[PDB]
Amino acid sequence: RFHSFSFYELKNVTNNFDERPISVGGNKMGEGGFGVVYKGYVNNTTVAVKKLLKQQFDQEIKVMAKCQHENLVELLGFSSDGDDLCLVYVYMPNGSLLDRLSCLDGTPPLSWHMRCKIAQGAANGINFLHENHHIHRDIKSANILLDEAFTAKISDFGLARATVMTSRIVGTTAYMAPEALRGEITPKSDIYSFGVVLLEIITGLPAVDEHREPQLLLDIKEEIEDEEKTIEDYIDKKMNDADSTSVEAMYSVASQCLHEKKNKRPDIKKVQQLLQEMT
Ligand SMILES: Cn1cc(Nc2nc(NC3(C)CC3)c3nc(CC#N)ccc3n2)cn1
Protein backbone atom coordinates (compact mmCIF):
# COMPACT_ATOMS: atom_id res chain seq x y z
CA ARG A 1 0.00 0.00 0.00
CA PHE A 2 2.81 2.38 0.97
CA HIS A 3 5.30 3.90 -1.42
CA SER A 4 8.81 2.64 -0.97
CA PHE A 5 11.41 5.42 -0.84
CA SER A 6 15.15 5.55 -1.18
CA PHE A 7 17.32 7.56 1.13
CA TYR A 8 18.58 9.97 -1.56
CA GLU A 9 15.03 11.05 -2.30
CA LEU A 10 14.37 11.89 1.32
CA LYS A 11 17.75 13.57 1.73
CA ASN A 12 16.84 15.97 -0.97
CA VAL A 13 13.21 16.59 -0.10
CA THR A 14 14.40 17.61 3.34
CA ASN A 15 17.17 19.85 2.01
CA ASN A 16 19.76 17.35 3.21
CA PHE A 17 18.01 16.84 6.49
CA ASP A 18 18.54 20.48 7.52
CA GLU A 19 18.13 19.69 11.16
CA ARG A 20 17.45 23.23 12.28
CA PRO A 21 14.38 25.42 12.98
CA ILE A 22 12.00 26.63 10.39
CA SER A 23 12.27 30.19 11.61
CA VAL A 24 15.91 30.30 10.65
CA GLY A 25 15.69 28.44 7.37
CA GLY A 26 15.84 24.81 8.35
CA ASN A 27 13.53 21.89 8.09
CA LYS A 28 13.37 20.52 11.62
CA MET A 29 9.77 20.66 12.77
CA GLY A 30 10.51 18.50 15.75
CA GLU A 31 11.86 15.41 17.45
CA GLY A 32 9.98 12.74 19.32
CA GLY A 33 9.40 9.03 19.22
CA PHE A 34 12.97 7.85 18.68
CA GLY A 35 13.50 10.22 15.86
CA VAL A 36 13.27 13.59 14.26
CA VAL A 37 10.69 14.98 11.93
CA TYR A 38 11.27 17.34 9.08
CA LYS A 39 9.03 18.82 6.48
CA GLY A 40 9.34 17.06 3.08
CA TYR A 41 7.60 17.00 -0.36
CA VAL A 42 6.08 14.45 -2.81
CA ASN A 43 4.63 16.20 -5.96
CA ASN A 44 1.28 17.60 -4.55
CA THR A 45 1.42 16.21 -0.96
CA THR A 46 3.54 17.71 1.87
CA VAL A 47 5.03 14.83 3.91
CA ALA A 48 6.36 14.37 7.44
CA VAL A 49 9.73 12.58 7.38
CA LYS A 50 10.47 10.56 10.54
CA LYS A 51 14.27 10.00 10.46
CA LEU A 52 15.33 7.51 13.18
CA LEU A 53 14.95 1.07 16.86
CA LYS A 54 14.35 -1.41 13.92
CA GLN A 55 11.53 -3.30 15.78
CA GLN A 56 9.78 0.08 16.40
CA PHE A 57 10.12 0.84 12.62
CA ASP A 58 8.78 -2.71 11.73
CA GLN A 59 5.80 -2.45 14.17
CA GLU A 60 4.77 1.11 13.14
CA ILE A 61 4.24 -0.11 9.46
CA LYS A 62 2.55 -3.35 10.73
CA VAL A 63 0.01 -1.44 12.93
CA MET A 64 -0.48 1.41 10.33
CA ALA A 65 -1.45 -1.08 7.55
CA LYS A 66 -4.41 -2.66 9.46
CA CYS A 67 -5.38 0.55 11.28
CA GLN A 68 -6.73 3.28 8.95
CA HIS A 69 -9.19 5.76 10.53
CA GLU A 70 -9.81 9.54 10.24
CA ASN A 71 -8.51 9.96 13.82
CA LEU A 72 -5.25 8.08 13.21
CA VAL A 73 -2.33 9.66 11.33
CA GLU A 74 -1.88 8.23 7.83
CA LEU A 75 1.42 6.61 6.79
CA LEU A 76 2.25 7.27 3.11
CA GLY A 77 5.72 5.71 2.95
CA PHE A 78 9.17 4.95 4.32
CA SER A 79 12.71 4.02 3.36
CA SER A 80 14.85 1.19 4.66
CA ASP A 81 18.27 1.83 3.15
CA GLY A 82 20.61 0.43 5.77
CA ASP A 83 20.86 1.54 9.42
CA ASP A 84 19.41 4.94 8.56
CA LEU A 85 15.64 4.48 8.59
CA CYS A 86 12.73 6.63 7.54
CA LEU A 87 8.96 6.76 7.96
CA VAL A 88 6.76 9.06 5.81
CA TYR A 89 3.20 10.34 6.61
CA VAL A 90 0.68 13.00 5.53
CA TYR A 91 2.15 16.16 7.11
CA MET A 92 -0.11 17.49 9.90
CA PRO A 93 -0.21 21.30 9.35
CA ASN A 94 -1.06 22.14 12.95
CA GLY A 95 1.52 19.83 14.59
CA SER A 96 0.86 18.32 18.03
CA LEU A 97 -1.83 19.13 20.62
CA LEU A 98 1.11 19.63 23.13
CA ASP A 99 2.59 22.41 20.98
CA ARG A 100 -0.81 24.08 20.28
CA LEU A 101 -1.73 23.99 23.99
CA SER A 102 1.60 25.75 24.76
CA CYS A 103 1.19 28.13 21.70
CA LEU A 104 4.66 27.10 20.53
CA ASP A 105 6.04 29.44 17.81
CA GLY A 106 3.30 32.02 18.46
CA THR A 107 0.27 30.04 17.26
CA PRO A 108 -3.03 31.38 18.72
CA PRO A 109 -4.54 29.59 21.77
CA LEU A 110 -7.08 26.84 20.96
CA SER A 111 -10.67 27.86 21.73
CA TRP A 112 -12.86 25.69 24.03
CA HIS A 113 -15.02 24.78 20.96
CA MET A 114 -11.86 23.52 19.18
CA ARG A 115 -10.71 21.69 22.39
CA CYS A 116 -14.02 19.76 22.58
CA LYS A 117 -13.71 18.57 18.95
CA ILE A 118 -10.06 17.49 19.56
CA ALA A 119 -11.03 15.52 22.72
CA GLN A 120 -13.88 13.74 20.84
CA GLY A 121 -11.66 13.02 17.83
CA ALA A 122 -8.83 11.66 20.00
CA ALA A 123 -11.36 9.42 21.90
CA ASN A 124 -12.67 8.14 18.51
CA GLY A 125 -9.10 7.27 17.43
CA ILE A 126 -8.44 5.37 20.71
CA ASN A 127 -11.82 3.61 20.27
CA PHE A 128 -10.80 2.38 16.80
CA LEU A 129 -7.52 0.95 18.17
CA HIS A 130 -9.30 -0.74 21.15
CA GLU A 131 -12.01 -2.19 18.79
CA ASN A 132 -9.10 -3.62 16.72
CA HIS A 133 -7.55 -5.12 19.92
CA HIS A 134 -4.56 -2.73 20.01
CA ILE A 135 -3.15 -1.00 23.11
CA HIS A 136 -1.34 2.24 22.17
CA ARG A 137 0.91 2.40 25.34
CA ASP A 138 2.02 6.01 24.76
CA ILE A 139 -1.14 8.17 24.73
CA LYS A 140 0.03 11.75 25.30
CA SER A 141 -0.62 15.24 23.86
CA ALA A 142 2.70 15.02 21.88
CA ASN A 143 1.07 11.95 20.15
CA ILE A 144 -2.16 13.76 19.20
CA LEU A 145 -1.58 15.57 15.92
CA LEU A 146 -3.77 18.19 14.27
CA ASP A 147 -4.63 18.39 10.60
CA GLU A 148 -5.65 21.37 8.39
CA ALA A 149 -9.08 21.39 10.18
CA PHE A 150 -7.62 20.78 13.71
CA THR A 151 -8.96 17.20 13.57
CA ALA A 152 -7.18 15.05 16.16
CA LYS A 153 -5.04 12.23 14.83
CA ILE A 154 -3.47 9.64 17.18
CA SER A 155 0.17 8.98 16.17
CA ASP A 156 3.16 6.79 17.15
CA PHE A 157 2.26 3.06 17.17
CA GLY A 158 5.90 2.00 17.74
CA LEU A 159 5.17 0.80 21.31
CA ALA A 160 1.61 -0.44 20.42
CA ARG A 161 0.62 -4.03 21.38
CA ALA A 162 -2.06 -6.28 19.83
CA THR A 163 -3.87 -8.88 31.66
CA VAL A 164 -0.33 -9.47 30.15
CA MET A 165 2.95 -8.40 31.89
CA THR A 166 6.40 -7.17 30.62
CA SER A 167 10.02 -6.74 31.90
CA ARG A 168 10.64 -3.62 29.69
CA ILE A 169 8.38 -0.84 31.13
CA VAL A 170 7.90 1.79 28.39
CA GLY A 171 5.91 5.03 28.16
CA THR A 172 5.84 8.64 29.37
CA THR A 173 5.83 8.49 33.23
CA ALA A 174 3.76 11.74 33.70
CA TYR A 175 0.91 9.97 31.74
CA MET A 176 1.32 6.38 32.97
CA ALA A 177 -1.28 4.44 34.92
CA PRO A 178 -0.01 2.95 38.26
CA GLU A 179 -0.41 -0.63 36.87
CA ALA A 180 1.51 0.30 33.66
CA LEU A 181 4.42 1.57 35.81
CA ARG A 182 4.32 -1.94 37.41
CA GLY A 183 4.66 -3.73 34.05
CA GLU A 184 1.00 -4.49 33.22
CA ILE A 185 -0.06 -4.13 29.52
CA THR A 186 -3.80 -3.27 29.35
CA PRO A 187 -6.04 -0.94 27.23
CA LYS A 188 -7.26 0.38 30.65
CA SER A 189 -3.79 2.07 30.97
CA ASP A 190 -4.52 4.02 27.69
CA ILE A 191 -7.72 5.35 29.39
CA TYR A 192 -5.71 6.71 32.36
CA SER A 193 -3.22 8.41 29.96
CA PHE A 194 -6.18 9.90 28.02
CA GLY A 195 -7.39 11.33 31.38
CA VAL A 196 -4.08 13.22 31.70
CA VAL A 197 -4.60 14.55 28.08
CA LEU A 198 -8.08 15.75 29.06
CA LEU A 199 -6.58 17.66 32.04
CA GLU A 200 -4.04 19.23 29.62
CA ILE A 201 -6.95 20.31 27.34
CA ILE A 202 -8.91 21.93 30.24
CA THR A 203 -5.92 23.65 31.92
CA GLY A 204 -3.41 24.15 29.05
CA LEU A 205 -0.79 22.97 31.56
CA PRO A 206 2.05 20.49 30.78
CA ALA A 207 1.62 16.96 32.39
CA VAL A 208 4.75 17.62 34.46
CA ASP A 209 6.46 20.76 35.65
CA GLU A 210 9.32 20.99 38.15
CA HIS A 211 8.35 24.62 38.93
CA ARG A 212 4.77 23.89 39.84
CA GLU A 213 2.74 22.64 42.77
CA PRO A 214 1.80 19.97 42.13
CA GLN A 215 4.50 18.90 39.76
CA LEU A 216 2.24 16.34 38.16
CA LEU A 217 -0.89 17.52 36.48
CA LEU A 218 -2.76 14.27 37.43
CA ASP A 219 -2.39 15.41 41.09
CA ILE A 220 -4.80 18.41 40.59
CA LYS A 221 -7.52 15.76 40.72
CA GLU A 222 -6.75 15.30 44.37
CA GLU A 223 -6.66 18.98 45.14
CA ILE A 224 -10.16 19.29 43.69
CA GLU A 225 -11.51 16.24 45.62
CA ASP A 226 -10.00 17.63 48.82
CA GLU A 227 -11.46 21.02 48.01
CA GLU A 228 -8.16 22.82 48.15
CA LYS A 229 -9.03 24.02 44.69
CA THR A 230 -11.70 24.02 42.05
CA ILE A 231 -11.66 23.05 38.44
CA GLU A 232 -12.51 26.66 37.73
CA ASP A 233 -9.24 27.62 39.31
CA TYR A 234 -7.43 25.53 36.75
CA ILE A 235 -9.42 26.30 33.54
CA ASP A 236 -6.95 27.65 30.90
CA LYS A 237 -7.11 31.47 31.05
CA LYS A 238 -6.12 31.60 27.34
CA MET A 239 -9.79 30.95 26.29
CA ASN A 240 -12.80 33.28 26.19
CA ASP A 241 -15.44 30.64 25.25
CA ALA A 242 -15.28 27.99 28.06
CA ASP A 243 -18.50 27.48 29.98
CA SER A 244 -18.56 25.84 33.44
CA THR A 245 -21.06 23.11 32.37
CA SER A 246 -19.06 21.51 29.53
CA VAL A 247 -15.74 22.11 31.37
CA GLU A 248 -17.07 20.23 34.43
CA ALA A 249 -18.47 17.55 32.09
CA MET A 250 -14.98 17.04 30.50
CA TYR A 251 -13.33 17.13 33.97
CA SER A 252 -15.81 14.39 35.12
CA VAL A 253 -14.65 12.17 32.19
CA ALA A 254 -10.95 12.95 33.05
CA SER A 255 -11.62 12.20 36.75
CA GLN A 256 -13.17 8.80 35.88
CA CYS A 257 -10.23 7.96 33.51
CA LEU A 258 -7.78 8.71 36.33
CA HIS A 259 -9.18 6.20 38.80
CA GLU A 260 -6.34 4.41 40.54
CA LYS A 261 -8.02 1.04 40.08
CA LYS A 262 -8.00 -0.01 36.42
CA ASN A 263 -11.36 -1.94 36.58
CA LYS A 264 -13.14 1.16 37.98
CA ARG A 265 -12.15 3.25 34.91
CA PRO A 266 -14.69 3.59 32.05
CA ASP A 267 -13.90 1.76 28.79
CA ILE A 268 -13.19 3.91 25.66
CA LYS A 269 -16.82 3.47 24.41
CA LYS A 270 -18.19 5.03 27.64
CA VAL A 271 -15.57 7.85 27.34
CA GLN A 272 -16.59 8.50 23.68
CA GLN A 273 -20.32 8.46 24.70
CA LEU A 274 -19.71 10.84 27.65
CA LEU A 275 -17.69 13.29 25.45
CA GLN A 276 -20.48 13.27 22.83
CA GLU A 277 -23.16 14.02 25.56
CA MET A 278 -20.97 17.03 26.62
CA THR A 279 -21.73 18.87 23.32
C1 LIG B 1 3.72 23.15 12.93
N1 LIG B 1 3.99 21.73 12.79
C2 LIG B 1 3.42 20.93 11.86
C3 LIG B 1 3.95 19.68 12.08
N2 LIG B 1 3.59 18.58 11.38
C4 LIG B 1 3.77 17.26 11.79
N3 LIG B 1 4.45 17.03 12.92
C5 LIG B 1 4.67 15.76 13.32
N4 LIG B 1 5.39 15.48 14.50
C6 LIG B 1 5.88 16.60 15.33
C7 LIG B 1 4.83 17.30 16.12
C8 LIG B 1 7.25 16.44 15.98
C9 LIG B 1 7.07 17.44 14.87
C10 LIG B 1 4.18 14.68 12.59
N5 LIG B 1 4.37 13.41 13.00
C11 LIG B 1 3.83 12.41 12.26
C12 LIG B 1 4.04 11.02 12.74
C13 LIG B 1 5.41 10.79 13.22
N6 LIG B 1 6.49 10.61 13.60
C14 LIG B 1 3.09 12.63 11.12
C15 LIG B 1 2.91 13.95 10.71
C16 LIG B 1 3.45 15.01 11.43
N7 LIG B 1 3.27 16.28 11.01
C17 LIG B 1 4.82 19.83 13.18
N8 LIG B 1 4.85 21.09 13.61
From Swiss-Prot:
Protein name, UniProt field: Interleukin-1 receptor-associated kinase 4
Its PTM note reads: Phosphorylated.
Say which family it is in.
Belongs to the protein kinase superfamily. TKL Ser/Thr protein kinase family. Pelle subfamily.
**Keywords carried by this UniProt record:** Acetylation, ATP-binding, Cytoplasm, Disease variant, Immunity, Innate immunity, Kinase, Magnesium, Nucleotide-binding, Phosphoprotein, Serine/threonine-protein kinase, Transferase
Its domain of life reads Eukaryota
Enzyme class comes to: transferase
Organism, as annotated: Homo sapiens
What is the first-listed, main subcellular location in coarse terms? Answer: cytoplasm
Q: Where in the cell is it found?
A: Cytoplasm
Molecular functions (GO terms): ATP binding; interleukin-1 receptor binding; kinase activity; magnesium ion binding; protein kinase binding; protein serine kinase activity; protein serine/threonine kinase activity
- In this chain, ATP is annotated as bound at 29-37, 50, 140-143, 156
